[PDB]
Design a protein around this motif. Structure first.
Motif, mmCIF file in Angstrom:
data_model
loop_
_atom_site.group_PDB
_atom_site.id
_atom_site.type_symbol
_atom_site.label_atom_id
_atom_site.label_comp_id
_atom_site.label_asym_id
_atom_site.label_seq_id
_atom_site.Cartn_x
_atom_site.Cartn_y
_atom_site.Cartn_z
ATOM 1 N N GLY A 45 42.535 -12.103 -29.847
ATOM 2 C CA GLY A 45 42.014 -11.143 -29.230
ATOM 3 C C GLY A 45 40.583 -11.474 -28.892
ATOM 4 O O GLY A 45 39.403 -11.304 -29.554
ATOM 5 N N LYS A 46 40.639 -12.238 -27.480
ATOM 6 C CA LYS A 46 39.470 -12.771 -27.124
ATOM 7 C C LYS A 46 39.771 -13.128 -25.630
ATOM 8 O O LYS A 46 40.631 -13.160 -25.135
ATOM 9 N N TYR A 47 38.376 -13.554 -24.868
ATOM 10 C CA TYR A 47 38.561 -13.932 -23.670
ATOM 11 C C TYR A 47 39.321 -15.059 -23.047
ATOM 12 O O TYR A 47 38.649 -16.244 -23.168
ATOM 13 N N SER A 48 40.363 -15.091 -22.457
ATOM 14 C CA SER A 48 40.960 -16.211 -21.797
ATOM 15 C C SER A 48 40.461 -16.517 -20.498
ATOM 16 O O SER A 48 41.044 -15.700 -19.678
ATOM 17 N N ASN A 49 39.718 -17.403 -19.939
ATOM 18 C CA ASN A 49 39.389 -17.440 -18.662
ATOM 19 C C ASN A 49 40.700 -17.965 -18.152
ATOM 20 O O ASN A 49 40.783 -17.898 -16.808
ATOM 21 N N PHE A 50 41.540 -18.383 -18.805
ATOM 22 C CA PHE A 50 42.783 -18.963 -18.317
ATOM 23 C C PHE A 50 43.374 -17.888 -17.773
ATOM 24 O O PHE A 50 44.175 -17.772 -16.494
ATOM 25 N N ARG A 51 43.615 -16.824 -18.459
ATOM 26 C CA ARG A 51 44.158 -15.704 -17.966
ATOM 27 C C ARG A 51 43.607 -14.422 -17.324
ATOM 28 O O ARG A 51 44.058 -13.548 -17.095
ATOM 29 N N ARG A 52 42.087 -14.772 -17.546
ATOM 30 C CA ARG A 52 41.288 -13.686 -17.137
ATOM 31 C C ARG A 52 41.711 -12.502 -17.905
ATOM 32 O O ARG A 52 41.762 -11.363 -17.295
ATOM 33 N N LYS A 53 42.003 -12.429 -19.266
ATOM 34 C CA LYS A 53 42.384 -11.220 -19.690
ATOM 35 C C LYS A 53 41.950 -11.385 -21.323
ATOM 36 O O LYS A 53 40.934 -12.307 -21.414
ATOM 37 N N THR A 54 42.250 -10.446 -22.090
ATOM 38 C CA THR A 54 41.663 -10.534 -23.445
ATOM 39 C C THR A 54 42.799 -10.642 -24.090
ATOM 40 O O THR A 54 43.429 -9.647 -24.710
ATOM 41 N N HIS A 55 42.962 -12.021 -24.474
ATOM 42 C CA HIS A 55 44.210 -12.236 -24.978
ATOM 43 C C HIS A 55 44.476 -12.300 -26.723
ATOM 44 O O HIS A 55 43.270 -12.210 -27.453
ATOM 45 N N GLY A 56 45.789 -12.157 -26.884
ATOM 46 C CA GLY A 56 46.200 -11.562 -28.237
ATOM 47 C C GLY A 56 45.503 -10.973 -29.382
ATOM 48 O O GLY A 56 44.754 -10.137 -28.880
ATOM 49 N N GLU A 57 45.842 -11.087 -30.622
ATOM 50 C CA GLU A 57 45.396 -10.267 -31.493
ATOM 51 C C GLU A 57 45.457 -10.974 -32.925
ATOM 52 O O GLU A 57 46.574 -11.229 -33.297
ATOM 53 N N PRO A 58 44.759 -10.631 -33.926
ATOM 54 C CA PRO A 58 44.980 -11.009 -35.304
ATOM 55 C C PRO A 58 46.275 -11.056 -35.912
ATOM 56 O O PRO A 58 46.963 -9.981 -36.103
ATOM 57 N N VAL A 59 46.575 -12.351 -36.282
ATOM 58 C CA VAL A 59 47.837 -12.397 -37.025
ATOM 59 C C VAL A 59 47.439 -11.566 -38.529
ATOM 60 O O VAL A 59 46.166 -11.748 -38.693
ATOM 61 N N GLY A 60 48.202 -11.458 -39.228
ATOM 62 C CA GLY A 60 47.604 -10.588 -40.499
ATOM 63 C C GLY A 60 47.227 -11.530 -41.339
ATOM 64 O O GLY A 60 46.151 -12.163 -41.733
ATOM 65 N N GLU A 61 48.274 -11.630 -42.485
ATOM 66 C CA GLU A 61 48.042 -12.142 -43.534
ATOM 67 C C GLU A 61 49.609 -12.843 -43.988
ATOM 68 O O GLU A 61 50.082 -12.535 -45.174
ATOM 69 N N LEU A 62 50.046 -13.109 -42.850
ATOM 70 C CA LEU A 62 51.589 -13.558 -42.944
ATOM 71 C C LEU A 62 51.473 -15.117 -43.352
ATOM 72 O O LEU A 62 50.671 -15.750 -43.052
ATOM 73 N N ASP A 63 52.524 -15.536 -44.181
ATOM 74 C CA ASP A 63 52.496 -16.899 -44.564
ATOM 75 C C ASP A 63 52.631 -18.022 -43.341
ATOM 76 O O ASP A 63 53.028 -17.392 -42.418
ATOM 77 N N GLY A 64 52.038 -18.991 -43.394
ATOM 78 C CA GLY A 64 51.925 -20.173 -42.579
ATOM 79 C C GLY A 64 53.687 -20.336 -41.902
ATOM 80 O O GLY A 64 53.740 -20.959 -40.752
ATOM 81 N N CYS A 65 54.527 -19.717 -42.909
ATOM 82 C CA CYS A 65 55.988 -19.856 -42.368
ATOM 83 C C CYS A 65 56.434 -18.750 -41.461
ATOM 84 O O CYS A 65 57.310 -18.659 -41.334
ATOM 85 N N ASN A 66 55.676 -18.268 -40.576
ATOM 86 C CA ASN A 66 56.009 -17.218 -39.367
ATOM 87 C C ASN A 66 55.684 -17.943 -38.146
ATOM 88 O O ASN A 66 56.193 -17.533 -37.085
ATOM 89 N N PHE A 67 55.105 -19.023 -38.399
ATOM 90 C CA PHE A 67 54.521 -19.924 -37.270
ATOM 91 C C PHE A 67 55.415 -21.156 -37.340
ATOM 92 O O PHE A 67 55.459 -21.697 -38.486
ATOM 93 N N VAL A 68 55.550 -21.756 -36.284
ATOM 94 C CA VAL A 68 55.874 -23.149 -35.944
ATOM 95 C C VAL A 68 55.021 -24.122 -34.936
ATOM 96 O O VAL A 68 55.003 -23.566 -33.610
ATOM 97 N N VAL A 69 54.474 -24.823 -35.535
ATOM 98 C CA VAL A 69 53.612 -25.606 -34.966
ATOM 99 C C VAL A 69 54.178 -27.085 -34.504
ATOM 100 O O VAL A 69 55.466 -27.379 -34.957
ATOM 101 N N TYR A 70 53.472 -27.767 -33.555
ATOM 102 C CA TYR A 70 54.130 -28.996 -32.957
ATOM 103 C C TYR A 70 53.288 -29.912 -32.045
ATOM 104 O O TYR A 70 52.336 -29.235 -31.384
ATOM 105 N N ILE A 71 53.201 -30.952 -31.989
ATOM 106 C CA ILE A 71 52.538 -31.800 -30.842
ATOM 107 C C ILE A 71 53.340 -32.157 -29.666
ATOM 108 O O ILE A 71 52.690 -32.492 -28.503
ATOM 109 N N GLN A 72 54.658 -31.968 -29.874
ATOM 110 C CA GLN A 72 55.335 -32.075 -28.722
ATOM 111 C C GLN A 72 56.556 -31.177 -28.781
ATOM 112 O O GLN A 72 57.281 -30.855 -29.773
ATOM 113 N N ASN A 73 57.282 -30.944 -27.365
ATOM 114 C CA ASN A 73 58.441 -30.283 -27.068
ATOM 115 C C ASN A 73 58.753 -30.500 -25.555
ATOM 116 O O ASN A 73 57.763 -30.787 -24.847
ATOM 117 N N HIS A 74 59.978 -30.150 -25.319
ATOM 118 C CA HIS A 74 60.104 -30.207 -23.628
ATOM 119 C C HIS A 74 59.136 -29.495 -22.933
ATOM 120 O O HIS A 74 59.083 -30.136 -21.686
#
Lengths: 557, 557
Positions: B347-376
């Motif tokens: 929930g903040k300014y992305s000059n990238f998108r020139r918009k006010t991007h996203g918003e607070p994830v709650g209190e959800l476990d780290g297992c709702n997300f999937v991180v990575y340093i690489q993908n296609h």
């Protein structure tokens, strides 16, 4: 903050202009200036010499001059130079307008009064006040093109109607109704914009390209710089509220408002209003509870929404009509369902839309919805704006009225309707651009088979109100409204509804009621005294038993 | 129910065809038949003579013949005649795949193994099994055009890849991994369709016209007959699940999926999966919690979603990169934030998108997300599919790996990555239509400055995996994965994160960890024993005090 703004002896000229490199303020009488292009796209200038009730124009790169799209006033016309005006400034943190006591009066300032202005409408206040109406719903005043439009071609969200009187007028109009204890309600367009004199289109990206409504396209609440466009708007509400002590809003066709943001612009807007303890209603097609629903239930929290479902069931029932939407209804059952389950399309097949329409309203009070037998749309779109009086027998028309005002819902009368008015409400437009004054023609012509040339003054005046009272009808209403209050019928959906082949008895908390569309036997299951009838054939004191009734409506106790 | 269906000795030929008046089944070898146009638009025919592993084609009004778009198999090619096949039929009501134990292995069957098939991938099972991977994520197999595509031009949602082996193959592939205790996960496209051989476009209205994604347009989940199109899909999931015992799904670019219905098609879909106690993940740009969020919190209930935010913070940090999305990050802070507040754009300014991007994830476990340093995507879209090994120093690349696997998140490895692989993952396509095999060229060329002619076999093979193990890297990983498990790091976001100018110590439940990007003093606030290091310069037994460290990573206890 978007048009102008007066400090002390100072005026500021904000101007969302991403696409422009250089724009110039241009007090028409004074001179031309240079704006302060900021990184976001906001050219800007600060003044003090001005105080003047001055006409101005922004002159852009291109070489063109234009008017503040957040123009507070477009006196000269749509291409008129924006203009300066005082700061209405005062208003109150509240609307006397509690909901439960809601009687809406949809009024079209134009064709209303022969004057066709605020004044015009001011004269009728006491008439209104009398009728029993609790609040006035003003059709759209956002500066439109010409002088003759329903007001849906508005293009100056911030600018009050030239024709209709404008600012002071509107100002007064409210101050007035306020005094008379009348609640005023503005009907705003946020899902699109008038096809004439819209400049937004150059200043930057006010409208989204990702989507396409029917009347072109909605704004940009999503992509690019949604921030700005979505601010336009939200402020735009706060204004009405502050610069006009307005009492509430009615939102045209919300379902043409596309927002994907984590916070739907609706809920966004609702908030603004509820912040000023105001009220919001929305026109919404989607049989979705979401709108009206509360936050805690994932709803935008709009206060209440129209329920065209109610109408149709009735209308197409009384009329033998089955065209366009009419096809989804026209049957006794529909009427009752709508009566106890707000929507007739609670999640079911609409051959009309060839889709699986809407979904269960919850357990929300009847006061989240607003029913009606007439409105500009319902009359207006007929090609010959036939009023409903012209398609049903008088007994019927009396019955209808009952239905809708005796509902737990939030009854709202179209103007004219209460006194038995018969002129049509046509579709009229006052466009200058040849291509529209043409498109528009085969439009209505193809869309609604409207022979009347909307662009013809005739069509307009022909729609004006013939204040030809009919005390038969006129009286009825007056009571109905009065009975309703008396009765304690509002919001409450704890109702039993029976129906026979052509009849419909409906208990309530404290009363019953008979709707007989045709001579028939009825096993009336209750005892009460007559409160009111369409006819005379009704038994002042009733008792449970089988009786034969005659096409009409009666009210017990 | 959409393609075919075998009763006993009976086959049924369902066919969504609103726009057609007459369509004809046409067993290629047998004959031509006449469908049973129903009111909804479903031509239809019932057979018994067929059992045959027969190729067929629907022949429409127009005069053209085509293939079941719910084709179970397109052997001959995309224009190949659909074909009959047995009913896989068996599967189980469950996936051994609990989440917490999630290690994802993004694999591109094609360029993977030199074979480039299921078999190919079968050989590597035990390798995989070894590595420690808990599940396999198969890039898109929905019948694409040609033989060389990432699989994003799929056009036969129901039809399994010709090339990749097809059905039996895919069949086996799973049965296999199943045995090896490996979880398989399919990556499906529901937000669009391949630009080649898509016939939907004639049978009726599968895609919505109201909107426009980037890769053309999404389907019709809203207007007209959404019912049907939205059924296509939902069934399409159930199939994979039933005709392939698949273990879960990964949804491409969900934010290109537009639904306004009271029930978002996502939530719609989630349901289907969770019904089979399967798992869903989605690729989602919108920094919206909504997706992953639970029902009770107004969320579609998707199981987990990718978090490109995590990546970028790291990547652009390590690389000095600031292009396209890169501009929104590339700084130490970003990395920590992402580390304790899932999204960097809460929930903040992305000059990238020139918009006010996203918003607070709650209190959800780290297992709702999937991180990575690489993908296609992350590799693929570079114009020269540079693997990350090629842009950071080895110490770095070792560090990264740490970060992402030592996260509470749900680590997933791109193929090749673990053994230190260096070939690029290019963008390749195998289109027949001249105009695409051209558009595509200036596309990638203009979009990603990709000099490689995606249509060049070279580009393809060049992307194949050089199974050149590097036990340095290869080992590391293996541990990391092992440490993670051992460690109990998964899902848990109860984490303290410190950082200095160029360093980052991070406590966990049971451990700490050092990330030093540059020689520097550290006030280490804790005592534990070395568990693993990038270097050797790390103190087997550590104690709280000020110490000077060297570019590297070490793990306490």
């Amino acid at each position: 903050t978007f048009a102008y703004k007066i400090d002390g002896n100072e005026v500021i000229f904000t101007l969302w202009a991403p696409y422009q490199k250089s724009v110039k303020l241009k007090v028409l009488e004074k001179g031309l200036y240079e704006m302060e292009r900021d990184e976001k796209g906001y050219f800007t200038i600060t003044l003090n010499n001005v105080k003047v009730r001055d006409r101005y124009k922004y002159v852009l790169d291109d070489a063109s001059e234009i008017p503040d799209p957040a123009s507070r006033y477009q006196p000269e016309g749509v291409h008129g130079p924006s203009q300066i005006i005082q700061e209405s400034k005062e208003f109150n943190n509240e609307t006397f307008l509690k909901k439960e006591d809601l009687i809406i009066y949809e009024i079209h300032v134009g064709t209303f009064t022969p004057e066709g202005t605020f004044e015009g409408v001011i004269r009728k206040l006491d008439y209104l006040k009398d009728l029993g109406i609790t609040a006035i719903e003003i059709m759209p005043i956002a500066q439109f093109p010409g002088k003759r439009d329903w007001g849906y071609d508005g293009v100056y969200l911030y600018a009050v109607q030239n024709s209709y009187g404008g600012p002071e007028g509107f100002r007064k109009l409210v101050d007035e109704a306020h005094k008379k204890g009348l609640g005023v309600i503005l009907d705003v367009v946020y899902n699109h914009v008038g096809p004439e004199g819209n400049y937004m289109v150059k200043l930057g990206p006010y409208f989204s390209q990702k989507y396409k409504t029917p009347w072109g396209l909605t704004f940009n609440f999503d992509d690019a710089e949604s921030d700005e466009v979505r601010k336009f708007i939200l402020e735009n509400v706060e204004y009405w509220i502050k610069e006009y002590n307005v009492d509430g809003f009615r939102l045209d066709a919300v379902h043409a408002i596309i927002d994907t943001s984590p916070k739907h612009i609706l809920e966004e807007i609702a908030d603004v209003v509820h912040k000023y303890n105001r009220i919001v209603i929305a026109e919404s097609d989607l049989n979705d509870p979401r709108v009206v629903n509360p936050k805690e239930k994932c709803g935008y929290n709009i206060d209440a929404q129209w329920v065209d479902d109610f109408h149709h069931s009735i209308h197409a029932y009384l009329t033998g009509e089955r065209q366009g939407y009419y096809t989804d209804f026209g049957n006794l059952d529909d009427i009752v369902k709508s009566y106890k389950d707000v929507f007739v399309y609670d999640g079911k097949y609409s051959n009309f839309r060839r889709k699986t329409h809407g979904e269960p309203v919850g357990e929300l009070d009847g006061c989240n919805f607003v029913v009606y037998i007439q409105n500009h749309d319902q009359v207006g779109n007929r090609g010959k704006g036939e009023r409903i009086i012209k398609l049903v027998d008088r007994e019927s028309y009396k019955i209808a009225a009952a239905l809708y005002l005796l509902s737990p819902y939030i009854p709202m009368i179209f103007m004219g309707e209460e006194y038995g008015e018969e002129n049509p409400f046509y579709f009229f437009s006052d466009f200058s651009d040849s291509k529209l004054i043409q498109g528009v023609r085969e439009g209505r012509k193809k869309e609604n088979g409207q022979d009347t040339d909307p662009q013809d003054e005739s069509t307009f005046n022909a729609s004006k109100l013939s204040w030809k009272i009919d005390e038969e009808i006129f009286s009825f209403y007056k009571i109905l409204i009065k009975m309703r209050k008396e009765l304690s019928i509002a919001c409450d959906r704890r109702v039993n509804v029976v129906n026979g082949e052509n009849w419909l008895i409906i208990k309530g908390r404290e009363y019953f009621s008979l709707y007989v569309f045709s001579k028939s036997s009825i096993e009336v299951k209750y005892s009460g005294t007559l409160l009111l009838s369409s006819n005379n054939s009704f038994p002042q004191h009733i008792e449970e038993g089988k009786y034969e009734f005659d096409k009409g409506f009666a009210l017990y106790k």
